[PDB]
């Protein structure tokens, strides 16, 4: 239970819900749970347009991170995405194969089972790539906690989606290109996994490669 309310920027928190679009309920901390809900794109309410949120002038190649509010108390990997906005990022919906993944992480295999590089973590940090084109984007920051995920169902989904306006940008073609929902099936073994009983030895975060241009 932790939500990611507000982007970082040159080592300063902007503010909570300034360039992040606040979702409907956020205030209780809670979890995605279906990967098929409009719910796993933005969180709840929050993909229909930011016409309340505003946009965060980054550079293609800028270190941009979220806040995390209390801290990731929950093992699993850390994902981010981006989608290219054919306008303004707050008139923009995210609807169709418009998101490429920027980052993943994965587990460390210990005596006491698998560690995770998010574990307590009060703040996360990705890098826009140096060859992404200019253009307003949504910058989609996840942790899928995996304690309960034995089971179908039982993955939980904690999300945002922040507003940047990329400039300094080269001739990168994002690819592949995926759709929330869509990316995500609930048999995936990156969402259904027993990360306890049997110690997985390669786990695989869902969704498409990384695109690094
Ligand atoms: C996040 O910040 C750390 C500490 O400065 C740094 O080592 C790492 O390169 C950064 N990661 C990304 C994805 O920018
Ligand atoms: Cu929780």
């Known amino acids: ?78 994902l981010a995405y981006m989608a290219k906005a054919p306008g303004d990022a707050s008139d923009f919906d995210g609807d169709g194969q418009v998101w490429f993944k920027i980052y993943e992480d994965g587990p460390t295999v210990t005596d006491d ?5 998010s574990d307590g973590a009060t703040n996360v940090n990705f890098t826009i790539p140096s060859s992404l084109p200019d253009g307003d984007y949504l ?22 989606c922040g507003q940047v306006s990329v400039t300094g940008g080269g001739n990168g073609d994002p690819a592949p290109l995926v759709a929330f929902p869509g990316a ?13 009983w049997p110690v997985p030895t390669n786990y695989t975060p869902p969704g498409p490669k990384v695109w690094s241009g």
Do not use: M
């Not at 089972?113 to 590089?117: A, C, F, I, M, R």
């Open 1 to 78: 239970h932790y939500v990611f309310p507000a982007l970082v920027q040159d080592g300063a928190a902007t503010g909570d819900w300034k360039y992040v679009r606040d979702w409907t309920g956020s205030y209780g901390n809670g979890p995605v749970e279906d990967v098929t809900s409009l719910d796993i794109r933005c969180n709840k309410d929050a993909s229909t347009n930011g016409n309340a949120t505003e946009t965060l002038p980054v550079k293609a190649g800028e270190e941009i991170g979220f806040t995390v509010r209390t801290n990731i108390g929950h093992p699993g990997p850390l």
């Open 139 to 160: 910058l989609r920051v996840e942790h899928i906690a995996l304690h309960g995920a034995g089971t179908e169902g039982g993955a939980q989904f904690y999300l945002s």
């Open 113 to 117: 089972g698998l560690t995770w590089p």
């Open 184 to 196: 995500y099936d609930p048999t995936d073994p990156g969402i259904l996994i027993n990360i306890y």
